[PDB]
Amino acid sequence: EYFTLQIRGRERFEMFRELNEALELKDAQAG
Amino acid sequence: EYFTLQIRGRERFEMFRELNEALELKDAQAG
Amino acid sequence: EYFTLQIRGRERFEMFRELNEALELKDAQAG
Amino acid sequence: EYFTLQIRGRERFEMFRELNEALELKDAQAG
């Protein structure tokens, strides 16, 4: 299930995007 | 400028939503 | 109960510090 | 340079620990 979050500010968006990509990379390997 | 981030998983979405709301509350007061 | 997390990199530390302060401000008011 | 952040609450600590480990895994590979 996918959800969408609206974020205000380019810098804030960049931060959350990096954190989300980091979590997805962790899962793809698992650990 | 608003951006939208697609997140996978209800629990992950809840976490990012709380973090985003926390940052917005901090800004509304400023500090 | 307090815990301590060791973080590598000033920029990363700044980011987590802002996020942690944001969550604490949210709790102090509650919502 | 390593920094230390004091966090209140086991659940909050768990969340930041997962996020920090995710960022470190991303860097170890780079991307």
Contacts of C18 in chain B (CB under 8 A): 23, 26
Please name the method used to determine this structure.
Answer: X-ray
Report the greatest alpha carbon distance in chain D: 31
CA distances for C21 relative to B25, C25, C28, D3, D7, angstroms:
11, 6, 11, 16, 10
Contacts of A18 in chain B (CB under 8 A): none
Per the CB < 8 A criterion, the answer to whether C22 and B22 are in contact is: yes
Alpha helix positions (H), C1-31 = 10-29
D7 touches chain A (CB under 8 A): no
- How far is the alpha carbon of B7 from chain A, nearest alpha carbon, in Å? 5
Helix (H) or strand (E) holding D20: helix D10-29
- How far is the alpha carbon of A14 from chain D, nearest alpha carbon, in Å? 14
Per the CB < 8 A criterion, the answer to whether C22 and A12 are in contact is: no
